[PDB]
Design a protein around this ligand. Structure first.
Ligand SMILES: CCOC(=O)Nc1cccc2c(Oc3ncccc3-c3ccnc(N[C@H]4CCCNC4)n3)c(C)ccc12
Ligand SMILES: CCOC(=O)Nc1cccc2c(Oc3ncccc3-c3ccnc(N[C@H]4CCCNC4)n3)c(C)ccc12
Lengths: 374, 374
């Protein structure tokens, strides 16, 4: 049992290991902490590390930093003790029973990154090993926190290999982490020792994302942009956070309703509706009236099966008049909003992604403020 | 400058005092600015309980951040986040900080709800221990509660009449709400008079005008928070749902959802009867005569001037069809959502409060979950 000022730890309890650094399970001011021990050859950089932690850890998805002490031969840095790294969480068995929502972990990670970027801090080394997963709080909630910021490979943006990086390098890394999480351990650029060369070669695939499943279509749309070889094509963190990938089912339904309201009095020859119907036959599966349940078919009469506009209108109509619908129709649709919107997105996997892209024409309008990034 | 382990301070920099002869200095901890409370040996037992509460409670953004405690031969020291002001200072001396009072109160109440969710009762909530943070890197200032679980004028009457329940804090908070929005008054009077008036149940909310929307709404809530009967006071989570805290956009969304809900309601049903009970006063005898002529014109027709239900339907109609309204009509209303809703609440100060009470009948319905506490 080693005591160094306010920091203590039993060197028996080792949590991990670069440059002779060791991380221990420990204690600070009667808090559980992880304690990183730094060798004298690194003290200058540690003081840089510690300064960054102080300006940054007033965001819930940035790791909380408590204290640093220094004896004759070492410097110790104490941070919040966590349950796991994201790498452990994705790869180790049993964490699956924590039942964490992968999208929420990713939202949290990206909120922490956005915070860092708002402070003119570039992470430079984001990867699952330094995304930490908290101990559960009093209400059983577990969160992701970023660490090891501002300081083998496989997560490095290709332009950083090809002297002061910009924020888009972190967006590339985050894109790979996103895929890693929702695919439960794959990586767009392949197997561990292969990834960084494939990055340099632009050799990726997102094959775990199915082309006709709504959730996968939406995830792909976002991830392909985040890992683009051209950094100027990558969205900012705040921009990522606005993507439909992160929308609740209620917000997705609300988007469909607003879109439908917006184009109710729009000319069928106007730019908006034409944009919406471009490639629409594929979106509605040729005739959407033939790819809905019989009870809904019956309850549906000026609607064209070949029109995306009309599908949206039908959706808004049944939502708006839900209470007065027959019991059989309410049953086939499911309850509002969650089951209702899945009735449609499960049957038309391209509808939300298609409609989101088409309605960028209106992204500057106050109404659509919640949906797009300005 | 005095040094005690990780905590340092210059004894000149005094921030305040306290019971038992405690002193609070401006100091430093691990290169962070902190307030440093110095405690005497004749209190160390209470301090260790203080510190323990701080350790379990300070994860929440609206609970004071606690950093460290040190002890020498003579004293004990507690370091917390250094703040800009107490709410007492803020209210009584800052206005160019441009802080929103409702937002400060919302933050104060979120902090309290956190403590209550941990089975902690504050017992001594008052403006002096609500702290106002220094501006962060993005200029944001927040309220944080302190001095929890440890003359007067803020004590609930049943506490001076064993182990207090959470409702005593709601009484204290109700008084604080009125103090902030009134810029220094108290429902039970002047400083030396308050606690006797509390015992006697003698309060008034005279700063709240009976024909101003914002005050009607504030009164509705505050009267309940400071009820003499503790069982009549809402919980902190319940407080946080009140219209007092709603954005203008949310206020308008409530009106729209209500109008949608009652569109196919019979006038024989309880919802519409509840909405029309006492409605003459809400619509000022005839609402058609209390709106601007451009709007009078455009509502001709089939709207009943004596009907709350119809006024709400009117508001919903013009909102939904806003884009397609004459410019002179879009002009008198103002833009969606903020100016539009104010057009109506400014003219009908009782509409939201009335409609909110009447529609409690539907508070269990999924649609109205945003608006009521379950
Ligand atoms: C400018 C930013 O600088 C930093 O953030 N510096 C750091 C200081 C101290 C620990 C760090 C750190 O922690 C760890 N580093 C290596 C191995 C494990 C942990 C760690 C941290 C917190 N909790 C835990 N818990 C273990 C429990 C057992 C299962 N695995 C997680 N581990 C990581 C990563 C990354 C950075 C750390
Ligand atoms: C279980 C909870 O126990 C606690 O929270 N214990 C506390 C420890 C240390 C300071 C405390 C504390 O701080 C102060 N107590 C008296 C006077 C000033 C401050 C204080 C604290 C932080 N910042 C500031 N800033 C000053 C700057 C000058 C203008 N006034 C505010 N003051 C208050 C209240 C209340 C409680 C405090």
């Amino acid at each position: 049992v080693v005591i160094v000022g306010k920091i203590s730890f039993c060197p028996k309890d080792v949590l991990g290991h670069a440059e002779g650094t060791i991380v221990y399970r420990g204690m600070f001011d009667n808090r559980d902490v992880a304690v990183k021990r730094i060798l004298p050859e690194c003290f200058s950089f540690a003081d840089r590390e510690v300064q960054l932690l102080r300006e940054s850890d007033e965001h819930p998805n940035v790791i909380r930093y408590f204290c640093t002490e220094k004896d004759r031969q070492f410097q110790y840095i104490a941070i919040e003790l966590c349950a796991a790294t994201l790498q452990e969480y994705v790869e180790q068995k049993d964490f699956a029973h924590l039942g964490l929502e992968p999208i929420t972990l990713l939202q949290q990670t990206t909120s922490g990154l956005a915070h860092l970027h708002s402070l003119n801090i570039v992470h430079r080394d984001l990867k699952p090993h330094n995304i930490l997963i908290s101990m559960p709080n009093a209400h059983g909630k577990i969160k992701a926190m970023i660490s090891d910021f501002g300081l083998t490979e496989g997560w490095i943006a290709p332009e950083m290999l090809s002297e002061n990086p910009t924020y888009t390098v972190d967006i590339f890394s985050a894109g790979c982490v996103f895929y890693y999480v929702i695919s439960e351990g794959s990586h767009p650029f392949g197997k561990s020792l292969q990834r960084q060369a494939n990055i340099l070669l632009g050799a990726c695939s997102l094959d775990c994302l199915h082309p006709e499943k709504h959730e996968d279509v939406i995830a792909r749309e976002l991830i392909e942009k985040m890992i683009a070889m051209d950094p100027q094509k990558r969205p900012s963190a705040k921009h990522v956070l606005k993507h439909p990938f992160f929308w609740s089912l209620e917000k997705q339904l609300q988007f469909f309703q607003d879109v439908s309201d917006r184009i109710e009095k729009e000319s069928l020859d106007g730019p908006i509706v034409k944009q919406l119907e471009r490639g629409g036959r594929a979106v509605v599966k040729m005739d959407w009236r033939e790819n809905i349940t019989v009870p809904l078919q019956t309850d549906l009469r000026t609607y064209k099966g070949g029109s995306v506009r009309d599908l949206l209108r039908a959706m808004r109509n049944k939502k708006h008049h839900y209470r007065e619908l027959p019991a059989e129709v309410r049953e086939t649709l499911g309850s509002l909003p969650d089951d209702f919107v899945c009735y449609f997105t499960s049957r038309f996997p391209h509808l939300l992604a298609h409609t989101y892209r088409a309605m960028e024409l209106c992204s500057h309008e106050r109404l659509f403020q919640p949906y797009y990034f300005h």
